[PDB]
């Protein structure tokens, strides 16, 4: 009752979580400088790290 059972679905969620956090660093990074109607939610998010 003080040992607990994860599994694939839960542990994967944690890994994809950690994937987002490193794209969060990059999202805010670009939003620091961005111009108006030029850039879009694409030029920011990098898929290879996720």
């Amino acid at each position: 009752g003080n040992r607990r059972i994860r599994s694939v679905g839960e542990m994967a969620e944690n890994q994809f979580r950690v994937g987002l956090v490193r794209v969060e660093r990059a999202v805010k990074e670009r939003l620091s400088l961005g111009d108006l109607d030029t850039l879009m939610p694409q030029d920011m998010i990098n898929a290879k790290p996720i």
Binding site: Q42, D43, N46
Partner: protein
């Protein structure tokens, strides 16, 4: 000094940040592919084949 300082930093990263030292024109050639493959990656949904960014690059491809 901002230009003289930022010169020496980036002009140094070109020389002694690599184990196999490469010329600066290679480093800017490279970034072209990485910036392109950030677009091409998501812009497609799969990712570019070695002959897809060959077209989007002026290079001998």
């Amino acid at each position: 000094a901002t230009w003289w300082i930022r010169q020496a930093i980036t002009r140094s990263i070109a020389d002694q940040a690599r184990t196999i030292r490469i010329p600066v024109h290679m480093i800017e050639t490279i970034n072209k592919l990485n910036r392109i493959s950030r677009q091409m990656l998501q812009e497609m949904g799969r990712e570019p084949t070695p002959e897809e960014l060959a077209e989007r690059m002026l290079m001998p491809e």
